[PDB]
Design a binder for these strands. Structure first.
Lengths: 109, 337
RNA sequence: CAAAUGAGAACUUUGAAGACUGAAGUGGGGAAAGGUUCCACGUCAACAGCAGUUGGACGUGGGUUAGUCGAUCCUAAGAG
RNA sequence: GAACAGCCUCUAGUUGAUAGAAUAAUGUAGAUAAGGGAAGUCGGCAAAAUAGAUCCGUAACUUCGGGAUAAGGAUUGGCU
RNA sequence: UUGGCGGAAAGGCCUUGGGUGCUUGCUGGCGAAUUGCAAUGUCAUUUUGCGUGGGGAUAAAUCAUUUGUAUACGACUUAGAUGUACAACGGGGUAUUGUAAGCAGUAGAGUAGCCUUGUUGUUACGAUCUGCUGAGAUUAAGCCUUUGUUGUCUGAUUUGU
């Protein structure tokens, strides 16, 4: 019963979206978070929470936050599962600031 | 590695800056000692120089076999394995090849390779080249090569200060370029239909072809260039703190600027500071070659003593040479309690 | 962004966010014109210069209620 | 705000225009530029500069009505 | 089997010796027809194979990922199966800006009174000023370590001397 890990990460959307056209910054932030989850858990099937979408779009197209504290939980697919048995769910985690935070495993307990 | 600035007294008897200090741009080339792994002999033929054989070293560096590979990580690392099996005897197939190089091969060159692991680059793939030995008989040259097998030659052995050398490098690439910047053609007037960064007339009616001498768009940069007459301003030692320290400054500081050379890093190895610019960009392999003639010019024969070397940050407008000087100017700070 | 529907969803629906028109509007009605395009119910053949589960498309149906709103009556330039 | 001008927002409506990736040249649209300032060019074409309001000041000429916002100067916020 | 010599494109030359076969150097014995009167009348060569034997070692490239010293796309410098390797975050260095929020001040032009009979009693405020505070924020996206945390490391195609 492995590959069910949940980890807290900090993603630097600043370096991610440096030099991007203003009308594509929040969509590109969504795609960069998908790629970040894929690089850190190997799962193509990345599902973003609507609250994380709200965090990304909090300040319009070009107002994506500099650093985002995400909670990526790799889970197991079900209900007519897709090609990949595993998928990642990316959630927003509320912090006062996203600075000074290191990636940390969280457990179901 | 990058460019920096020096201050030196200028000595040409007759200039209005004679015995007056001058501020000069210099280029720093980080030169860790290169390993001599192998030699090749060239017999002269009525079709040019033709290599007759190459004799390699017994143990080759991991970086040099990486040079020989492409997907190095997913490899059996079988490279020069049977050559080293040929080795481990006295001269079973080795003394014979060296003897062939002596008997023939008027021109003999040593195969040398860089220490990319010493250089701050992330390459791990050494640069393998040939260097021609230019003295003595062929027997002397091949004896030199065989004696220097698996040995590291430092640049202070070959290049001296106040010396004119040539830099051979591939210049910085700039992709596809228009004719206006690729050739420096006059821009067309503002009221030009269909663009103005072009050459207006690319040929007459006859000959009914575009000639090779007409300027056209295409690749700019990434060209091989050999620029001559660069004066070596310093041959500094990596195993030496206060590299950038001179008899005028006497401050214990290294040539590496504040925050490190931009896009490159540090110069923890031996280095050369040459005057002016050289072809190629930072992080790029360059070849430093001895002059092909005897240049006096009353400029090649100039004795250069450096009075000061700029080690301020190149990542902006750095006002300080050393962290101690920065702390001395700014006093105590909030971060350091 | 998620969910639903669906064989199939960048485009359908529903939530959530970000926006826009900014009251001489991208809003609510009408005149000429169109003629059923209105509205409900079913899916890929065509059409919607990508797609389509959607549609002003396709098939089948339903829909327009006046003594008071208009016409009808009057005369205008004019026609006869 | 002088203002159904330009900007932002309630009501209402829309989120429709094939998309994804990358960011070569040349384009289209929009900008900036040392020092010089029309030397460019048929030609100051194009662009720039000017600009609202208050106060001061305002010539030649004149059909006495104008020219005139002539030209030319200064000020402008917040708070008590 | 023994010396070599030959690098211009050497790929050729004798020998030192042992074994074997012909010898037209000089003389004999047998055979040849009939392919019919000629018919080129068939005699020498960049490759291989279910195959046989005198013997040998079990490699890479490419796609996918990455990289940015490159780049329109291809190409091009790079990295990636346990390394002081790579990557995502965090301190440092570095740099850019200019002194953050909050709290406090008998600071601040001033506007309205108390009575316990006027050298700090105080309130409803008040742009700004001062202190914490060269602070705070940003810092590679084409500047470094994972001495800190956390993860990654056997996926697909082709190559005949």
């Amino acid at each position: 019963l492995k590959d069910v890990v949940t980890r807290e990460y900090t993603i630097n959307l600043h370096k991610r979206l440096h030099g991007v056209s203003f009308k594509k910054r929040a969509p590109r932030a969504v795609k960069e978070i998908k790629k970040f989850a894929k690089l850190h858990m190997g799962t193509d099937d990345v599902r973003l929470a609507p609250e994380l979408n709200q965090a990304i779009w909090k300040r319009g197209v070009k107002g994506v936050e500099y650093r985002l504290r995400l909670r990526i939980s790799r889970k197991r697919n079900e209900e007519e599962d897709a090609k990949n048995p595993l998928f990642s769910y990316v959630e927003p985690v509320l912090v006062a600031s996203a600075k000074g935070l290191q990636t940390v495993v969280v457990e179901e307990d | 590695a990058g460019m920096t600035t020096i201050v030196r007294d200028l000595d040409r008897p007759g200039s209005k800056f004679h015995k007056r200090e001058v501020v000069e741009a210099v280029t720093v080339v980080d030169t860790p000692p290169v390993v001599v792994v192998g030699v090749v002999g060239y017999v002269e033929t009525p079709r040019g120089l033709r290599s007759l054989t190459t004799v390699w070293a017994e143990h080759l560096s991991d970086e040099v076999k990486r040079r020989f590979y492409k997907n190095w990580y997913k490899s059996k690392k079988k490279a020069f394995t049977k050559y080293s099996a040929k080795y481990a005897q006295d001269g079973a197939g080795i003394e014979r090849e060296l003897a062939r190089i002596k008997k023939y091969a008027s021109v003999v060159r040593v195969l040398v390779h860089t220490q990319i692991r010493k250089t701050p680059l992330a390459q791990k793939k050494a640069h393998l080249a040939e260097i021609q030995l230019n003295g003595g008989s062929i027997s002397e040259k091949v004896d030199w090569a065989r004696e220097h097998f698996e040995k590291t030659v430092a640049v202070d052995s070959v290049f001296e200060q106040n010396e004119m050398i040539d830099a051979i490098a591939v210049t910085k690439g700039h992709g596809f370029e228009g004719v206006t910047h690729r050739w420096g053609t006059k821009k067309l007037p503002r009221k030009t239909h269909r663009g103005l960064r072009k050459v207006a007339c690319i040929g007459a009616w006859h000959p009914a072809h575009v000639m090779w001498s007409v300027a056209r768009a295409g690749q700019r940069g990434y060209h091989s260039r050999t620029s001559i007459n660069h004066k070596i301003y310093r041959v500094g030692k990596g195993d030496d703190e206060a590299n950038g320290a001179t008899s005028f400054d006497r401050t214990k500081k290294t040539i590496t600027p504040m925050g490190g050379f931009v896009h490159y890093g540090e110069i923890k190895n031996d280095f050369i500071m040459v005057k002016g610019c050289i072809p190629g960009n930072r992080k790029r392999i360059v070849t430093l070659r001895k002059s092909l003639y005897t240049n006096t010019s009353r400029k090649a024969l100039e004795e250069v003593s450096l009075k000061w070397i700029d080690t301020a940050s190149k990542f902006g407008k750095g006002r300080f040479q050393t962290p101690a000087e920065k702390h001395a100017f700014m006093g105590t700070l909030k971060k350091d309690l």
